[PDB]
Design a protein around this nucleic acid. Sequence first.
DNA 1: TACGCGCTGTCCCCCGCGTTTTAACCGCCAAGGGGATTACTCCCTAGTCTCCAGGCACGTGTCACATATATACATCCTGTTC
DNA 2: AACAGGATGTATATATGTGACACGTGCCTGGAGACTAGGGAGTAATCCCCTTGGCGGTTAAAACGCGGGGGACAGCGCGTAC
Lengths: 102, 87, 122, 123, 95, 68
Amino acid sequence: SGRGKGGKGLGKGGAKRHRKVLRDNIQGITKPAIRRLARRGGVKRISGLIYEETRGVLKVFLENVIRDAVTYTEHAKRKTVTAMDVVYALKRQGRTLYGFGG
Amino acid sequence: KRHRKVLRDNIQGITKPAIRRLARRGGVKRISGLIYEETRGVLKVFLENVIRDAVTYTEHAKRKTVTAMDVVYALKRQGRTLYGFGG
Amino acid sequence: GKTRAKAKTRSSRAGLQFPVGRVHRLLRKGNYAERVGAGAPVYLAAVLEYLTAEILELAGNAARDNKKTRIIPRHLQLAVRNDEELNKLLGRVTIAQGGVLPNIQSVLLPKKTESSKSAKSK
Amino acid sequence: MAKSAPAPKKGSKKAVTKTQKKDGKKRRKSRKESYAIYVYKVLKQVHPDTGISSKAMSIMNSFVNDVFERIAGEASRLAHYNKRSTITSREIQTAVRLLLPGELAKHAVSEGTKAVTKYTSAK
Amino acid sequence: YRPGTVALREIRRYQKSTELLIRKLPFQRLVREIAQDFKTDLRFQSSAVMALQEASEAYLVALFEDTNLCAIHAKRVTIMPKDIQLARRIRGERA
Amino acid sequence: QRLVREIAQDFKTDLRFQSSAVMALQEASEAYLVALFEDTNLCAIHAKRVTIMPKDIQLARRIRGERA
DNA sequence: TACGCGCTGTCCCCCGCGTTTTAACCGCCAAGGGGATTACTCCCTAGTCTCCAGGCACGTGTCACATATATACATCCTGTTC
DNA sequence: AACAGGATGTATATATGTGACACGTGCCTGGAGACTAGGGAGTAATCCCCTTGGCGGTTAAAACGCGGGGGACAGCGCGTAC
């Protein structure tokens, strides 16, 4: 039920929509999140600097994957990635995903 | 006449200085004595995977002479793509 | 077709149950080659048929060991990881909800008494 | 029922919802070709009293699609190494060895060679 | 409950259990943050976020598995910042 | 040349060879080992040593792959 | 808040590397042959437009179930100390 | 020399919903039929180039044991870090 124009985005904003800057969010991966991943590998103890490095490793990994999916996104002109652009990005980087798509 | 020379291998042609020279290409100053035996196993494992693919390319082309193109086709699948010897 | 292949499909002719014909469309769809013979689509299904059955068969044995009937993504990872030959075919990939096979190392588990080697005092 | 082959309606489906009794129509959904029926078929053969979960099929549907892409892709590359313009069972018989190692090649070739052999010599 | 040996108990449970270890929305807002710099107002579906999370979890687990073997190599147990440097570069990622 | 001929002969007999192909086999294998030594060295410093050992070699391969 | 565990300090003890024998092995020079990989010519059997037909198999309603996922009782094994 | 303690892992019967299937209609598209038709391959002669070895003539890379320096392995230990 169309009721306005969105254009770039934020359709019918006025004072009804909500948005935040989202300055830093890599800190959301805290000690329990990193420890659980280490438990799967078989780690006993983890240093403090590894926790920040683990966030940095995740940041670089996400940045590399997104730029590939973004390129496919503009080709299809869609404003959202549904299931395949992530899969195609993962396939090209050697991280091919089975399930959730294809 | 099946009985032919089968004892150790030509992998001993990879000499002790040659293994050290290969390490000298990288940054080393001391390598253990078991590296010489290790290099023989590592070289054979890498060679077997590459040569098996190259044999398949030669068989598919119904040829018997292993050409340089068959070698690079085998390599490019698993990395270490040899630039040159092609085209 | 009184004696032709109206009754028997292409897949049933070769004894397979995989679509075969859908694969034949995929070769044309993917532009893999200018011309596709009849041997190519049936052969590709034949590789899939044995691969489909074997992996499920190995996974199905894990479900009984896991005290479950329906196969969950956990068993799919277990079947692949257990077979070392399957590791070469795949294993550089990510399986959704697959899990990780236990790989505990011997450096952990201090089997020796936690007290000091020289004496009881730590 | 006479003949509907002359088609002024190809997209068809539901546009205005001009229906008589049951409504029951929507926009023409794209055909998502899935191996779900065929994967379950062989699953019954190896283990009848197992069943399956939906998430398992999603993983296996991707597996079958990607495996075919690799086999057909490698065969296509082999189809360019030599100047052959036609791909037949032989082109994939050699293609199995490069990707499927050890006993997997033997099982794939034996099943594949038997399938093409029994595909012909019939009718 | 010795802290060193209790971690071994967690390894058995977490490896046996299958679940998403990291939080969903904090990761969902994380990927959205990166997208804004690349392309402002770039939307994500529910399936896309979960697919990115699972791939990220598997990638981090593999790195933890490799860094664990780097520790025993140095006659150690815990992971130090040196471990993550050796593992990443030797894979051809860092350099 | 004798080594590569026997490896091919071990799986398929009656195989011919070319000098250019032999050079290609040698160059790829040598560079594969050369890159490994530098990769293996980074494991040695992590262990506070300069020696190269099978412990270093096995670890160097495992993280990069080639063992699974 | 606490001990598990980095890091320093130190030399067993077991080798990687330097220095000489040691001449046999890798290596290139001047030519032939038998076998095998491309041009050139003939003829041939699948898929491929004609040009139509009917069955599978995918959704939209309509009913009606079966195993996964955790709960109430009831009761043992494992791990880490004193 | 070996028992206490509190929670996690077991059986065993106990509830539910969502995942799954079964009807009953409905309609293209994907297979199937059956010849006419032009172009990639089976199959014959042609032709030079490719690999296999004679076949000698110096020379730079192995092959191996001894020597004296030194670096990896390993023992404890006080205080830092998870």
